[PDB]
Amino acid sequence: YSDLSKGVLRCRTVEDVLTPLEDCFMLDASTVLDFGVLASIMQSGHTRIPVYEEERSNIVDMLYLKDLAFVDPEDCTPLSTITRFYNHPLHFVFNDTKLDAVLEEFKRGKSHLAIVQKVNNEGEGDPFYEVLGLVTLEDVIEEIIRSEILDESEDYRDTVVISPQLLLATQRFLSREVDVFSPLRISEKVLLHLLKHPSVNQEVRFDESNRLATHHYLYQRSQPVDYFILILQGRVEVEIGKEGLKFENGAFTYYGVSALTAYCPDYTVRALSDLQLIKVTRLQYLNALLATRAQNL
Amino acid sequence: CRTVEDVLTPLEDCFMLDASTVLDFGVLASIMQSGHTRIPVYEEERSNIVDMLYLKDLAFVDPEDCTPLSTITRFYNHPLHFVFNDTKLDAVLEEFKRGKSHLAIVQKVNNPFYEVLGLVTLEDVIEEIIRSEILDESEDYRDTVVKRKPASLTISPQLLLATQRFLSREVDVFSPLRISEKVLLHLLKHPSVNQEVRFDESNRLATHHYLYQRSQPVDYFILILQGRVEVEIGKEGLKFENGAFTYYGVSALTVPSAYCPDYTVRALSDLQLIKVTRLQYLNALLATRAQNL
């Protein structure tokens, strides 16, 4: 009987949990559903997305994620033609209405998201309803759990402390093929500068006597790592997976991208010859991003 | 939505700290990354919880002090909250409220002994209660129903699991955050995904030997399981030979912060590979999002 959990929230209104309209995830009905939009929508984590038409506050329809099933980007179908196809309801709620009412509203007409409205009597003539955000069940549950019995543990945030031409080719390859080096994150100028930096361009001397010298290992499996490596010239032996599948890789095969976005690889890379490579630590990546966001503005 | 047992989380999946644990730098970083306001402290075995550690008590500890958790816990002495598995949700909510504890440790009988099942947090109970009685009709899937007119228009499981793990751990677009391990494995098990290519030895440059042609649109990802290929990179045409576990066309699946490669891949042998179209990726994203978690 959740009627008990309903007795300790009758003093809270929507204002407490309201997420303001400016901070709400929405879609302009005129959006075109290409791969980018579809991927970003399906990854946003929302199953229910409002759709407005002109101003951000003129919500008209609602998009369920399943509405997008069987939708091909090639068709470049607009979101309007998907929402004007289905007939999903818009659940409304008032600025001042209590939370038990909001919950029995989510129940009646199954939903987890309601358009919070407030009346505007300031003005001669008839009044109007001014949308001022959304109320989502996540926030209501959070408020109930925080205000039923509160713990003074708001301390979450406790903090505890090679040929220049081939390098240009590498810059172009990375900008066009690897995402973390996309021009949107690191300008092509800054990336070119990074790849030609001495602390990035590295070489390895292969002691043939100690054929398995510790310095021949660019990556060691299940061992913390902090850098990205692309092989410019030479050959390496890669041992992949728990099984230890051994392959031989050469130039233009990059490793450890997840180290820039702890991270421990799923493989071990060892040097088989004299190597020319480019190593990029996470800190170097952060400084490149900072420089790029300073350059843009 | 009946008893504690139905919503608790098991000892296996819980985060705790040993009582003799030194509070070095690593433990502090680990806890702060876990983001848990409560950490149990077991005496000898995890099944035996002896103390409770509130995050409030652990904020201002100096990593350089290398204090032992014993000092913190014994200084704050936070009482414990036990409970059985048969107790309903309303009873445990009243227990949490009248008591001053945010979580309890559940006890069932494996008979004769009281085995600790796990920890029930108030978050879990409130979640279950004010979630199980309000559904969202957008999380159910009735898309089998055809609403618009219908137009009339394999290999070793061991290395396959290895491929799934490799992609999940190394390539981002296949990260578990985007495609669940189940859905990714299911995708790798598929005729149009697991593909082979036959190398016409007479016409070494057959149009079908070209998986990617530089500056020519493509819309799919390829990882090489078996065979050899020639990669011609850049306007310069740097030619290299690549083999197994060298993936291509990742940018066709990523969404930035209309894809043409910076290279041309040609087949040199009979190829066994994994092909992933943009539509296949989008349907994988939906499929993973169908499973609530």
Question: Which helices and strands appear, and what pairs or packs with what?
Answer:
Two copies of one chain form a homodimer.
Chain A: H1 14-17, E1 19-20, E2 27-28, H2 35-43, E3 48-52, E4 59-64, H3 79-83, E5 92-94, H4 99-107, E6 113-120, E7 128-136, H5 137-148, H6 164-177, H7 188-195, E8 201-204, E9 217-219, E10 227-233, E11 236-240, E12 245-249, E13 254-255, E14 267-271, E15 275-281, H8 282-296
Helix pairs in contact in A: 6-7
Organism (chain B): Homo sapiens (Human)
Subcellular location (chain B): Cell membrane
Function (chain B): Probable metal transporter.
Structure description:
Two copies of one chain form a homodimer. Chain A has a four-stranded mixed sheet. In chain A, strands 8-15-10-13 form a four-stranded antiparallel sheet. In chain A, strands 9-14-11-12 form a four-stranded antiparallel sheet, with no helix packed on it. Chain A folds into two domains: 1-146, CBS-domain (Roll), CATH 3.10.580; 164-297, no CATH class. In chain A, helix 6 (164-177) packs across helix 7 (188-195). Chain A has helices spanning 14-17, 35-43, 79-83, 99-107, 137-148, 164-177, 188-195, 282-296; strands at 19-20, 27-28, 48-52, 59-64, 92-94, 113-120, 128-136, 201-204, 217-219, 227-233, 236-240, 245-249, 254-255, 267-271, 275-281. Chain A is 26% helix and 25% strand. By secondary structure, chain A is of the alpha+beta class. Chain A has eight helices and 15 strands. The longest helix of chain A has 15 residues, at 282-296. Chains A and B meet through helix 2, helix 4, helix 5, helix 6 and strand 12 of A and helix 1, helix 3, helix 4, helix 5 and strand 12 of B. Chain A: Keywords: CBS domain, Cell membrane, Glycoprotein, Ion transport, Membrane, Phosphoprotein, Repeat, Transmembrane, Transmembrane helix, Transport. Chain A: This is Metal transporter CNNM3. Chain A: Residues 18-79, 86-152 form the CBS domain. Chain A: One of its GO terms (molecular function) is transmembrane transporter activity.
